[PDB]
Amino acid sequence: PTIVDVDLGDRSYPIYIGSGLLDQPDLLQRHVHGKRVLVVTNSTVAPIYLDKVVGALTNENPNVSVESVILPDGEKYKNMDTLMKVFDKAIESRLDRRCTFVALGGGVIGDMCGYAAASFLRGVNFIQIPTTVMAQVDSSVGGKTGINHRLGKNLIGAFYQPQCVLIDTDTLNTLPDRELASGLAEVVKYGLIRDANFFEWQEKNMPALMARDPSALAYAIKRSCENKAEVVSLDEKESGLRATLNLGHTFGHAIETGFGYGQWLHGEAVAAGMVMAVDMSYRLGWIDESIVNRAHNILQQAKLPTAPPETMTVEMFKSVMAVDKKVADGLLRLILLKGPLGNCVFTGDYDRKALDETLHAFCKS
């Protein structure tokens, strides 16, 4: 069991990482400070891990009782109505401020569960058990929770930290290849924004990760968590630094909202968003040809898309980018690369013609 910690003072919490951690009941029990637990998962994950997870919380612990809600599987259910099922279940069972929610699944569940937890009775303790690469390197950590609105991605939610995060890499064993690769998008992101040695290591080790080698995947998770924990501890609520985690995400969200929720996996949208934001960066003269080539090579190694869907138009991009949460006072700040690899800027001061070229170069219409 490795531990990357997130230090937010009295609200600090541990990220436990290893194999078979779902068979170490002591880990979860330590963060369940009440009698009752509500596991939140979806229809795909539930048959695989729920019994295991209730097992890990109860069968060797007699004073803990566990309930579940199984929500439908899909990014397209990341909405207020599907979230209302969690509040409905919790109130039907008469759960109270001492209960604990447990997010069992990918990033869709983590985000929904975290926000529900933030809001139920004005907040109850919750724990993350990510079961995707995406969630294990990104979504489970940091306490950004919430839902999509039809006009945009993550527009309603809460900053709300879990009590712990339990990553067991065995759970990746049941994850389809496509879901695996899409999680690596965010791993590459850490490399580009602030982690050149991490990036470098990925250029060498991407075949391992794609072959799902345990040691590789475990380090990519660990090192991703180190980055994300550092940033969150410094900038929990995104005054400045935290926005760096949004490289390729202004575009990537435009791909998700535009291309209709769910068709492309998030990581697939980020893959393509990142290429676009690399291209803009070059066009602005802020980065080298070499970064462009290496960004393009590594995502190709991960069999992720390096351009957006051919139905995405320039107008859809602009219209969805208009509700990006990096807008301040009607001004669109972007995350762009600048200088040697591992360097990035959070800025609203970029030549808009460069942005316009990038859109027109990547869009068929």
Next chain:
Amino acid sequence: PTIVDVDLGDRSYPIYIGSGLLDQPDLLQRHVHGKRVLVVTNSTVAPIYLDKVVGALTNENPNVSVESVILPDGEKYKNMDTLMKVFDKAIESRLDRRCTFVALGGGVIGDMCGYAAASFLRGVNFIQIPTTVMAQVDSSVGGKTGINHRLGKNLIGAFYQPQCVLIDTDTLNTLPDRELASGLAEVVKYGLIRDANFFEWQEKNMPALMARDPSALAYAIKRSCENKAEVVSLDEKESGLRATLNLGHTFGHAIETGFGYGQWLHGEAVAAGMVMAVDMSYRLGWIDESIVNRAHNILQQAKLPTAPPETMTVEMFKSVMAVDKKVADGLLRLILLKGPLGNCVFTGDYDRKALDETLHAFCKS
């Protein structure tokens, strides 16, 4: 302009109190930190105050553009579906993280706008402009925001603190006697929980408050906000001490949900429920009978109910109380009077016979 602070370090903020405050644009504009504002109000309040508040937000203020969203008026509407109207409007007009919400109304609007602000883009700034007594003396202060569920009161929300609170005493001039009176319930509450001298003051001053004397009303407000600000600063998230503000509110919330949201005013529900709490306190032999009948009498001078509605039952009270937020690991903790006037306890330890003796005394079935 009388000020009363709320002390939460870097989240501290003033409550301004006085007449004609809506005629001092300076006060609102100080706390609007961006170019955009969305005034959330309702259809009763809008055509009386919206123009004026838009006028104050923009006078000598080119930098700021102001929009509004008009919600339906009623406790009935204090729920998630209606709140979607705030999000939908916000996103449609592309409001960003730097926008400010202005909650313009009674406590329904405050709680709703508060929780909408907490959640919009995971938190934007908001400001409180209470226009009912209930709001001016209680709900506007403390950053307890949220909404009802069918099965219970304020079971979804957040602890979110406003940028400031603008009590303009003139807004009470348009409020009906019934609404005004119902506000006085929380004024009394402060007396009984922690402020004996204030209580004694109200006993002299009740006829004055019911006649809308400017001085009495204003001092009630200041004293009511001082109490709450003191409690909120010490216990913002309700670890312990804050729960004391819920005297008679366990019973009260049960009346609201039991008898139908908005059939009685909150204040009216709270009055009856306070009277039940004192009865239970006496039955426990924790309280002298002078406190019982002193309470009964001040409420009657406010023309407030001292019984719950005739169709409330014992079962209804018990089933709604089971989802009170004062319940912890299945144990219902209550606010009860013990000792001289102005002293309180929050306890899980009481004889349950006292509890359903008081339930059977007040309910026809």
